[PDB]
């Protein structure tokens, strides 16, 4: 399934959210790149056990609802590049990161803070997932002290 350039922004709170992807057991790869998505409603990735790849790049996603990815235990490649993601919380990207093979969320305004990327930095340091251009296109945007700094070059020993 591909939904590139289809402006699904407003389709996902007024008038009742659309419960798309209902019972798509055999769905392999879902692609909603550059659809202007702004907010992900809860309970939309359920029952997608056999899903393999997710591509949600070229969008504006900052509100990462907890437990959005629960049945995505078979995810092989997560694409979130060129988005507005600020924090990477464990409860959102946990199950998809259990057996992920490749990851791509470059060109994002990352927040180099203990509340945002500590879990992400620890996972990156403790995984073998293929992340292209990890040291180049993963610079943080805030605060000023950590602005323009590599994501991997962040010490999490002072926050736990």
Partner RNA sequence: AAAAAAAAAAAAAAAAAAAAAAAAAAAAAAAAAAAAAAAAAUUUUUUUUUUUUUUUUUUUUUUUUUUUUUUUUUUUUUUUU
Q: Which two tokens stand for residue 125?
A: 């340091």
| Of 18 and 153, CB closest to RNA | 18
| Of 38 and 50, CB closest to RNA | 38
Least separation in angstroms between CB 32 and RNA: 11
**Spatial distance between the Cα atoms of 103 and 118, rounded to a whole number of angstroms:** 17
**Spatial distance between the Cα atoms of 59 and 120, rounded to a whole number of angstroms:** 21
**Quick check: helix, strand or coil at residue 2?**
strand
* Positions that interact with RNA (CB under 7 A): 5-7, 9, 34-36, 38, 58, 60
| Of 36 and 94, CB closest to RNA | 36
Least separation in angstroms between CB 33 and RNA: 9
Decide the pairing of beta strands 102-104 and 130-131. parallel
Least separation in angstroms between CB 83 and RNA: 11
């Amino acid at each position: 399934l591909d939904f590139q350039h289809n402006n699904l922004a407003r389709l996902w709170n007024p008038g009742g959210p659309v419960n798309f992807l209902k019972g798509l057991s055999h769905l392999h790869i879902l692609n909603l790149e550059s659809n202007g998505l702004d907010e992900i409603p809860v309970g939309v990735f359920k029952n997608l056990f056999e899903l393999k790849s997710i591509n949600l790049g070229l969008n504006n996603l900052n509100k990462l609802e907890p437990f959005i990815f629960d049945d995505q235990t078979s995810l092989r490649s997560l694409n979130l590049q060129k988005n507005l993601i600020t924090s990477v919380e464990k409860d959102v990207f946990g199950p998809p990161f259990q057996n992920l093979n490749s990851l791509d969320m470059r060109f994002n305004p990352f927040d180099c803070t203990c509340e945002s990327i500590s879990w992400f930095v620890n996972w990156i340091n403790q995984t073998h997932t293929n992340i292209s251009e990890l040291s180049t296109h993963y610079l943080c945007n805030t605060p000023h002290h950590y602005y323009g700094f590599p994501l991997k070059l962040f010490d999490t020993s002072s926050c736990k």
